[PDB]
Design an enzyme around this catalytic site. Structure first.
Site, PDB file in Angstrom:
ATOM      1  N   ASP A   1       0.913  -1.272  -0.102  1.00 38.20           N
ATOM      2  CA  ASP A   1       0.195   0.139   0.010  1.00 38.20           C
ATOM      3  C   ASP A   1       1.073   1.076   0.076  1.00 38.20           C
ATOM      4  O   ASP A   1       2.113   1.195   0.463  1.00 38.20           O
ATOM      5  CB  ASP A   1      -0.959   0.176   1.283  1.00 38.20           C
ATOM      6  CG  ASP A   1      -0.652  -1.137   2.115  1.00 38.20           C
ATOM      7  OD1 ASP A   1       0.726  -1.357   2.654  1.00 38.20           O
ATOM      8  OD2 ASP A   1      -1.475  -1.778   2.557  1.00 38.20           O
TER       9      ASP A   1
ATOM     10  N   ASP B   1       1.158   3.522   1.857  1.00 30.40           N
ATOM     11  CA  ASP B   1       1.034   4.130   3.453  1.00 30.40           C
ATOM     12  C   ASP B   1       2.513   4.524   3.683  1.00 30.40           C
ATOM     13  O   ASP B   1       2.653   4.516   4.962  1.00 30.40           O
ATOM     14  CB  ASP B   1       0.137   3.631   4.280  1.00 30.40           C
ATOM     15  CG  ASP B   1       0.905   2.140   4.908  1.00 30.40           C
ATOM     16  OD1 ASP B   1       0.150   1.697   5.814  1.00 30.40           O
ATOM     17  OD2 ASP B   1       1.936   1.875   4.484  1.00 30.40           O
TER      18      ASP B   1
ATOM     19  N   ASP C   1       5.121   2.856   2.138  1.00 31.63           N
ATOM     20  CA  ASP C   1       5.980   1.468   2.255  1.00 31.63           C
ATOM     21  C   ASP C   1       6.942   1.333   1.250  1.00 31.63           C
ATOM     22  O   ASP C   1       7.037   1.501   0.225  1.00 31.63           O
ATOM     23  CB  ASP C   1       4.894   0.381   1.736  1.00 31.63           C
ATOM     24  CG  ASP C   1       3.974  -0.131   2.433  1.00 31.63           C
ATOM     25  OD1 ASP C   1       3.408   0.173   3.657  1.00 31.63           O
ATOM     26  OD2 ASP C   1       3.245  -1.450   2.091  1.00 31.63           O
TER      27      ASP C   1
ATOM     28  N   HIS D   1     -14.522 -22.289  17.160  1.00 28.77           N
ATOM     29  CA  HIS D   1     -15.475 -21.432  16.917  1.00 28.77           C
ATOM     30  C   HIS D   1     -16.767 -22.298  17.792  1.00 28.77           C
ATOM     31  O   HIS D   1     -17.877 -21.918  18.014  1.00 28.77           O
ATOM     32  CB  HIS D   1     -16.082 -21.416  15.489  1.00 28.77           C
ATOM     33  CG  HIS D   1     -14.983 -20.607  14.481  1.00 28.77           C
ATOM     34  ND1 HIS D   1     -14.946 -19.490  14.546  1.00 28.77           N
ATOM     35  CD2 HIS D   1     -14.095 -21.419  13.760  1.00 28.77           C
ATOM     36  CE1 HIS D   1     -13.693 -18.834  13.790  1.00 28.77           C
ATOM     37  NE2 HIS D   1     -13.322 -20.123  13.358  1.00 28.77           N
TER      38      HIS D   1
HETATM   39 MG   LIG Z   1       1.148  -2.188   6.265  1.00 29.32          MG
END
Ligand SMILES: [Mg+2]
Ligand SMILES: [Zn+2]
Ligand SMILES: [Zn+2]
Lengths: 84, 107, 1426, 134
Positions: free
Chosen positions: C472, C474, C476, C1076
């Site tokens: 991404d 962000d 990276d 679960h």
């Molecule tokens: Mg990440």
């Protein structure tokens, strides 16, 4: 151990790994200032030249395919069918 | 083939390998109660003549040891009583290709 | 490398012969007498003393000197010096064996302790494998503790034969610190074993005795585990560090040696002076200590041998020890030159294969080019351009092997290049690079790219290549490595190139899609309601670089000529493309504009989105890539992107709170839909506070309570939302992102505009940490939803203190099983990988490892490459015997079962031919023989499978490529079809061999396919279904023969690693410790990562050891028949049926002081002992659940002790069942031992270990008499403990369908091959609960690897890493130093055939590119000149 | 603006948007040796040793430090220091190879043992650029 041109068994095709090394190997040589058996229609890139040297199957090389047991089968780029 | 019930004397068993060529085997009863080889998962094996093997090798450029192995004491190895050396041809069903040969030597 | 030519010939390493240093060689090799412990100061004078480090060895001070050897510093590997020890020592690592060896040989005469004579011996002396032929011989001699003088020969045990003499008892031995101590026996004799002696003995061990024990006469005698001459490693090994002059900082190692040296001297000086006999051995241990602590420092003998300041010390070993150290830290992973790294971002303007490099880097990274006539011009140009202007260079190099610093060197501007010179130049547009993001566990984590120099400091990549890297923007950081040779850059170009990677082998499907904007927009652009006018239509057309420059005729013309979004987007889709879809209500007029038709590259109908243009299987991409070429494809993203992106830029797209607010009424309608779900809870609340709740199979009333409440509220959320989801108009952005599928799920809609939901911790809704409640803002024992954690508000209204808080606890969960999962995930990932390195498809099409051992005689049992496979259907399997006939059945002899002439040309002139109904039938009896074959394989009935060559499409193409018309009849001879489709298979060769064995294996690897083939190329099919013509047909056959041939696998492909990666990739994403089921204890089973751990590990004590057993044939739906066997298996013990045990004082065996007991006694006397009674009341209720009868019970107890304990018992009709009994000198005491012996060692009905067992109604699918496949349910028992061996031999079960999730057993019982089957089966599941597909072949390979060998070889240090594989390779995993030691110990020899083997010797490893040699045929080199 | 990354209007970037200051700060002392031998803060040059730095000392004053206004950049020196060894070995401190900016404030002080103590502070200004995180 050696294998006759006959009794041949391997693929009649060219493993991408085969081609790619050839191509690479050739281009390398070309740029090593090596004889080029084709009309450079104005190509200045050893790869590009090699790629041509290949689509006209005029590349003096023989792939020696080794078998687990040691024996090998030699195949020329003239023969090897280039599909891919 | 000898079929004991509860057990054999450790004094007894040590007499089988004392009369070659002839060979002897030993199975418990509770063992043979069910034929495993009939089990959904177990697929049919097969013994191979000392030629069909000297071939299998030749045709695969195999060194005895490079072959997948089966335990002498392997359930099915017993059910067909193999010997150190004989090879079995496990032929199973495959979701990739209906059938799929395979082999196994005997260690 | 290393500069300076050398006559020396240049070769490669082939073998690695590990051995051990004979003192004699140590000296031999040595150049330094190494006497003094000091470093230099010739009394302070700077230099080096002919004492330690350089009494000739390497050097420092930038001085050639190295025994004339000059070459100085760089270009000179130090030389070894030696240092004679005063008294022999142990080898820290070898103490282990040095001991064991002794245990294997008696001292004095030193000889084996078991000749050919003792039989158990022989059986050992034959095992060829010095590694076990040892730990065997030892197991047989650690016991013999007397050097026998004579033993009975092969004859009479009366006659004794002699061998080697002296029976001097052998001492047992124990390891104390670094010395060996043994005892002799009558009151022991404890004396220390002097090294000086041990050595001797060893020295005296025989040649055949060496060998017999894991040793070697030449490279490693045992006598060499004891150090006599210590090799002293030269400087480059223990380099100093100078702070200019007068300031020297030496290396740890240099210090130890010192101490070792010091220690040594102080010892010698004690044997040539006042030698206080046993005050010496007090400093001999010091030597041993240092000489030992030097190589290793992490022992059990505590003393860490600290170095002033508390600093531990760095033992040689400490250096190799994995991760961060020599083997794994410098060799398997190096830091490297020509590497870069920065933040990355998205560029909707680059091609897929491109990577925008910022200039800054281009100008720093250099590709050494070779000066050649082809370039000289352009090259010199750069040189001139300097190393500051972009298109430039920054070094030139002459044949004389010397650098020219273009940034300085007076002759910078000068220089006339030369043929044969090189010019390290700047990276320029279009250079092939190795882009990548970490962490790397995917082939697609490192793909080659076309460079594209650009401004600003961030690496640029195309969105659609985001997922392969899984990155991404962000912030990276990504990496980048630059190729260096011409062949190297070729390996990146022809192999690792982004477009070459579009179809993923570990999921036989596309791994690159179309996201966000592009995607979210390509839809808005598609709609029927989307029309584009001239002006724009043009700019778009233009944007597309391949636009044939033909403005396409407007969909509409009437008053104002317009174009449809679909229309122009179509310009992006090449020609020859064909794609049929059909979603739901689809009908070649799809009113909802569902599905999609694309013909000759033109969207005919249907809205484009994720399904059509995503990483889906038969998606647009998947096609293009397979139909046109990797090239054409990549080039496709672009276009779409550009066209689309552009239109989006102008149509615009947004998102906002308005997209989360729903229709006023739909809010109330929800409120009450929530409230109603509260009462439906409240009801079940009191209805459980009034004890009116059916326990339910659900176990536990309480447990059964929740499961109803939860299920009630969830049911409400999902549905509370299903309201908003449908009330959000088709103009709500959020919905739009969802429809296009660019981002979002309907859930996200609920939780925002309708209602969050019930939170959770381990399943069980918010617990009671607050003594019988949730928050102190609550009344004790409140089980209502608003307290067990139910968030009623929508993210729009906003949680409440309580809601908020619980919600938290709830989320914060993942963030944890991610902190731990991450810890073990990694390890798995590696092991797999480190286990299947060497596995690659060889040239025979076998699949072996670094040894030669097969592991598949055909990759995936089919020799196909994962890349070429999809979910095609086997029409033959499914369907009723009725329809099957109405489809593939052709009877030329029958008015109602012959091909209506309106199909075939030679139709009417066939009806009757008897020579064709021979073929026409040979075909049928085959599709039939097939049907059966399949149903014997895919029992499930499942018809959809992964198979090469998509034939559904291959025909769809054949269709509109010849514009075939469904009106006029074909022209195919029925001989044509059948006789051809028969020749086709004759050529789908996968294997090739000239002999039978192989030509037989061929027919096999082909089978499953053809069946699909014939299934499709059915004479009745070919004509009545898809009107093919001789031509079309003959085409369809052509492609298939190829598309298949291409689908094969390439003899090189390192599958091992591929396989590995593909399991660990998903392995990593697996959830952790979830369960679960929790909230229904007792029905708890191990699932998830801890399980997978359990596997690879080949663990015995598994958490869940269940085993499902199916009944015998008929006996199925026989409800009762069920328990009838339940109780015939589920271990039942007296203790389970008892309600008490009482000891009474009743002395009158003819009357019990107990009332309620009377009637009993009276009965057992009409039809000695002891007075001590033991009475056992039993549970009635517990005597039916698991059927039983008083008789039986006691009857057992009686035959349990037999004749020596009197027993009695009431009758099945008494309101109180019982069991009285007495014994027969302390009676009470003994009558309690028999109190236990009566509860835990006494069985009644059942098998041991198998506690609980239960019945279940499974839905089995099976062959209806009519042919169809139908659901014929059956009851089955699931254990909860496991002892197959015997639950198998029980009547009522089908010992053919039995199964224990514990393959470990199913292997011991049923036999390996089946074991595998289980193994693979278990594994497939673990991975498949995440809904994670992984093409068989991989797991398949893994499994096959584990098995083969013999049984279950684990994927761990304790397993696969012990195999017949060479050192270094194993050396590269968990046991590093240890390994090596016991390598040179047993004189190992390394093939150097395993990847790691080479990566460690920096040689080209036999792998794909390296799976073969290349050569120059001078003879073909001649004929190549005009 | 795709996948977690925005489009930031440059115009406003210029009008001052998101501009940040950034101060770093090196520091050194004149190590001492009981047997009377002290380092020093001078501007040396060759004279026996040769062991200096590639950096441009030419930005230093005579006390071994730089002064505010100055504009440092690459590996320029920032502090001059010499150790007498038995005599010109450098102990000067360059500006971190990758940074660059303007000195901003310096200061010399005494350190208990009566040693010279300096703390150089080089300030730079950073403007919202592409790779930048927000
Ligand atoms: Mg990440
Ligand atoms: Zn040297
Ligand atoms: Zn002896």
């Amino acid at each position: 151990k050696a294998i006759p041109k006959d009794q041949r068994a391997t693929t009649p095709y060219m493993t991408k790994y085969e081609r790619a090394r050839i191509l690479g190997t050739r281009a390398l040589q070309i740029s090593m200032n090596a004889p080029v058996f084709v009309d450079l229609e104005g190509e200045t890139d050893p790869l590009r030249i090699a790629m041509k040297e290949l689509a006209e199957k005029k590349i003096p090389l023989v792939i020696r395919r080794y078998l687990p047991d040691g024996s090998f089968e030699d195949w020329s780029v003239e023969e090897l069918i280039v599909d891919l | 083939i000898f079929v004991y019930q509860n057990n054999i004397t450790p004094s007894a068993m040590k007499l089988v390998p004392s009369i070659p060529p002839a060979t002897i085997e030993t199975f418990n009863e509770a063992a043979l109660v069910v034929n495993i080889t009939h089990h959904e998962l177990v697929p049919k094996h097969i013994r191979l003549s000392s030629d069909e093997k000297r071939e299998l090798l030749k045709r695969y450029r195999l060194k005895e040891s490079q072959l997948p192995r089966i335990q002498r004491a392997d359930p099915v190895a017993l059910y067909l009583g193999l010997k150190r050396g004989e090879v079995v041809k496990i032929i199973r069903k495959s979701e990739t290709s209906g059938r799929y040969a395979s082999y196994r030597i005997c260690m | 490398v290393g500069q300076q030519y050398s006559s020396a010939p240049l070769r490669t390493v082939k073998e690695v012969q590990f051995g051990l240093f004979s003192p004699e060689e140590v000296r031999a090799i040595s150049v330094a007498k190494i006497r003094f412990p000091e470093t230099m100061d010739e009394t302070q004078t700077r230099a080096k003393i002919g004492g330690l480090n350089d009494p000739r060895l390497g050097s420092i001070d930038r001085n050639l000197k190295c025994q004339t050897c000059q070459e100085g510093m760089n270009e000179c590997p130090g030389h070894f010096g030696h240092i004679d020890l005063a008294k022999p020592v142990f080898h820290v690592g070898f103490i282990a064996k040095i001991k064991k060896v002794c245990e294997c040989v008696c001292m004095h005469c030193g000889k084996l302790l078991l000749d050919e004579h003792n039989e158990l011996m022989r059986q050992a002396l034959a095992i060829k494998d010095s590694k076990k032929r040892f730990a065997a011989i030892w197991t047989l001699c650690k016991t013999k503790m007397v050097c026998e003088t004579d033993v009975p020969s092969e004859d009479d045990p009366t006659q004794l034969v002699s061998r080697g003499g002296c029976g001097n008892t052998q001492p047992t031995i124990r390891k104390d610190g670094l010395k060996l101590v043994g005892s002799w026996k009558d009151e022991p004799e404890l004396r220390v074993l002097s090294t000086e002696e041990i050595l001797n003995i060893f020295k005296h061990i025989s040649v055949k005795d060496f060998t017999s024990l894991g040793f070697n006469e030449v490279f490693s005698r045992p006598e060499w585990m004891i150090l006599t001459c210590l090799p002293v490693p030269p400087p480059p090994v223990r380099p100093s560090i100078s702070f200019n002059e007068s300031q020297r900082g030496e290396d740890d190692l240099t210090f130890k040696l010192a101490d070792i040296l010091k220690a040594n001297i102080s010892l010698e000086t004690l044997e040539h002076n006042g030698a206080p006999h046993h005050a010496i051995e007090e400093a001999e241990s010091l030597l041993q200590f240092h000489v030992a602590t030097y190589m290793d420092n992490d022992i059990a003998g505590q003393p860490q041998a600290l170095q002033k300041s508390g600093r531990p010390v760095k033992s040689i070993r400490a250096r190799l020890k994995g991760k961060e150290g020599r083997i794994r830290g410098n060799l398997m992973g190096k830091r490297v030159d020509f590497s870069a790294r920065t933040v990355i971002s998205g560029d909707p303007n680059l091609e897929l294969d491109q990577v925008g490099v910022p200039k800054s880097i281009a100008k720093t990274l250099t590709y050494p080019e070779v000066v050649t006539p082809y370039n000289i011009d352009r090259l010199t140009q750069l040189v001139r351009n300097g190393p500051n202007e972009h298109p430039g260079a920054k070094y030139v190099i002459r044949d004389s092997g010397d650098r020219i610093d273009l940034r300085y060197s007076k002759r910078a501007g000068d220089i006339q290049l030369q043929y044969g010179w090189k010019v390290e130049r700047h990276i320029m547009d279009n250079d092939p690079v190795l882009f990548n993001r970490q962490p790397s566990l995917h082939k697609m984590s490192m793909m080659a790219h076309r460079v594209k120099v650009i401004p600003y400091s961030t690496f640029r990549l195309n969105l659609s290549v985001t997922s392969p890297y899984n990155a991404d923007f962000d912030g990276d950081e990504m990496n980048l490595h630059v190729p260096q040779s011409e062949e190297t850059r070729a390996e990146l170009s022809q192999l690792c190139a982004v477009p070459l990677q579009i179809v993923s082998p570990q999921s036989n499907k596309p791994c690159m899609g179309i996201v966000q904007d592009t995607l979210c927009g390509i839809r808005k652009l598609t709609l029927r309601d989307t029309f584009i006018e001239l002006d724009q239509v043009l700019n778009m057309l233009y944007w597309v670089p391949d636009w044939d420059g033909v403005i396409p005729t407007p969909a509409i013309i009437k008053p104002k000529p317009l174009w449809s979004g679909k229309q122009i987007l179509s310009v992006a889709i090449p020609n020859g493309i064909h794609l049929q879809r059909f979603d739901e209500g689809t009908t070649l007029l799809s009113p909802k504009d569902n599905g999609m038709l694309i013909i000759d590259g033109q969207i005919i109908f249907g809205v484009v989105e994720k399904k059509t243009v995503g990483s889906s299987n038969g998606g647009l991409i998947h096609v293009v890539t397979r139909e046109k070429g990797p090239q054409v494809c990549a080039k496709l993203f672009g276009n779409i992107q550009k066209v689309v992106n552009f239109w989006l830029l102008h149509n615009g797209f947004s998102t906002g709170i308005g997209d989360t607010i729903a229709d006023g009424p739909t809010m109330r309608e929800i409120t009450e839909t929530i409230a109603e779900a509260k009462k439906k809870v409240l009801d079940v609340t009191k209805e459980a506070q009034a004890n009116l709740l059916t326990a339910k199979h659900g176990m536990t009333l309480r447990e059964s309570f929740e499961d109803n409440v939860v299920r009630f509220l969830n049911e409400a959320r999902d549905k509370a939302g299903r309201l908003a989801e449908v009330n959000l108009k088709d103009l709500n952005n959020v919905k739009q992102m969802v429809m296009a599928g660019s981002k979002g799920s309907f859930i996200n809609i609920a939780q925002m505009s309708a209602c969050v939901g019930q939170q959770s911790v381990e399943g069980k809704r918010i617990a009671f940490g607050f003594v019988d409640r949730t928050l102190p803002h609550f009344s004790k024992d409140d089980y209502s939803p608003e307290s067990k954690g139910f968030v009623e508000n929508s993210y729009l209204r906003g949680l409440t203190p309580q809601e908020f808080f619980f919600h938290a606890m709830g989320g914060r969960e993942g963030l944890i099983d991610t902190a731990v999962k991450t810890a073990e995930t990694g390890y798995i990932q590696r092991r797999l990988v480190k286990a299947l390195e060497d596995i690659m498809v060889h040239y025979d099409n076998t699949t072996r490892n670094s040894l030669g051992n097969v592991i598949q005689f055909i990759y995936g049992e089919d020799g196909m490459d994962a890349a070429h496979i999809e979910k095609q259907s086997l029409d033959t399997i499914g369907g009723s015997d009725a329809a099957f006939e109405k489809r593939y059945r052709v009877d030329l002899l029958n008015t109602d079962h012959t091909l209506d002439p309106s199909l075939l040309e030679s139709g009417s002139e066939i009806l009757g031919d008897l020579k064709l109904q021979v073929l026409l039938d040979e075909e049928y009896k085959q599709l039939v023989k097939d049907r059966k074959f399949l149903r014997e394989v895919f029992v499930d009935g499942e018809a959809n499978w992964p198979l090469p060559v998509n034939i559904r499409r291959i025909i769809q193409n054949a269709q509109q490529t010849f514009h075939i018309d469904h009106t006029k009849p074909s022209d195919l001879t029925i001989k044509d079809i059948v006789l051809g489709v028969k020749d086709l298979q004759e050529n789908l060769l996968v294997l090739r061999g000239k002999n039978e064995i192989i030509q037989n294996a061929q027919r096999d690897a082909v089978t499953l396919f053809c069946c699909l083939l014939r299934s499709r190329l059915a004479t009745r099919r070919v004509l009545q279904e898809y009107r093919l013509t001789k031509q079309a047909f003959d085409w369809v056959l052509s492609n298939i023969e190829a598309q298949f041939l291409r689908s094969v696998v390439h003899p090189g492909e390192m599958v091992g690693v591929l396989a590995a990666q593909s399991i660990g990739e998903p392995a990593t994403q697996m959830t952790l410790n979830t369960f679960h089921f929790a909230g229904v204890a007792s029905k708890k089973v191990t699932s998830g990562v801890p399980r997978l751990k359990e596997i690879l590990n080949v663990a015995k004590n598994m958490k869940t050891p269940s085993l499902t057993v199916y009944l015998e044939p008929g006996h199925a739906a026989d409800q009762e028949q069920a328990k009838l066997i339940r109780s015939a298996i589920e271990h039942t013990t007296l203790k389970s049926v008892t309600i008490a045990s009482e000891i009474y004082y009743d002395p009158d065996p003819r009357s019990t002081v107990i009332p309620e007991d009377e009637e009993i006694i009276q009965l057992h006397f009409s039809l000695q002992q002891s007075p001590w009674l033991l009475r056992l009341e039993l549970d009635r209720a517990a005597m039916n659940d698991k059927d039983l009868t008083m008789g039986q019970v006691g009857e057992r107890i009686k035959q349990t002790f037999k004749n020596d304990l009197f027993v009695i018992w009431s009758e099945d009709n008494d309101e109180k069942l019982i069991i009285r009994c007495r014994v027969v000198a302390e009676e009470d005491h003994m009558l309690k031992k028999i109190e236990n012996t009566m509860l835990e060692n006494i069985t009644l009905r059942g098998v041991e270990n198998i506690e609980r067992v239960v019945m279940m109604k499974y839905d089995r699918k099976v062959p209806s008499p009519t042919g169809e496949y139908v659901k014929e349910p059956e009851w089955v028992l699931e254990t909860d403990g496991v002892n197959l061996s015997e639950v198998m031999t029980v009547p009522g079960i089908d010992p053919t369908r039995i199964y224990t999730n514990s393959f470990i057993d199913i292997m011991e019982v049923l036999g390996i091959e089946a074991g595998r089957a289980a193994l693979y089966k278990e594994v497939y599941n673990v991975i498949a609960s995440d809904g994670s597909y992984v093409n068989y072949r991989h797991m398949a390979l893994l499994v096959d690897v584990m098995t083969t060998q013999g049984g279950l070889t684990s994927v761990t240090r304790h397993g696969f890493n012990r195999s017949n594989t060479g050192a270094l390779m194993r050396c590269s995993f968990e046991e590093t130093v240890e390994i090596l030691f016991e390598a040179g110990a047993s004189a190992e020899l390394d093939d150097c055939r395993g990847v790691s083997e080479n990566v460690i010797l920096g040689q080209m490893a036999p792998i794909g590119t390296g799976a073969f040699d290349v050569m120059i045929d001078e003879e073909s080199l001649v004929k190549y000149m005009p | 603006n795709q996948e977690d990354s925005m489009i930031m209007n440059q115009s406003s970037i210029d009008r001052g948007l998101f501009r940040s200051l950034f101060f770093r700060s090196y520091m050194d002392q004149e190590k001492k040796y009981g047997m009377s031998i002290t380092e020093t803060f001078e501007k040396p040059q060759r004279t026996n040793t040769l062991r200096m730095k590639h950096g441009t000392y030419d930005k230093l004053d005579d006390d071994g430090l730089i002064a505010p206004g100055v504009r440092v950049s690459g590996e320029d020196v920032i502090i001059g220091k010499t150790t007498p060894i038995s005599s010109k070995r450098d102990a000067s401190t360059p500006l971190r190879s990758t940074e660059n900016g303007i000195v901003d404030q310096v200061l010399v002080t005494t350190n208990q043992d009566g040693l010279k103590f300096v703390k150089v502070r080089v300030r730079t200004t950073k403007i919202p650029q592409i790779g930048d995180k927000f």
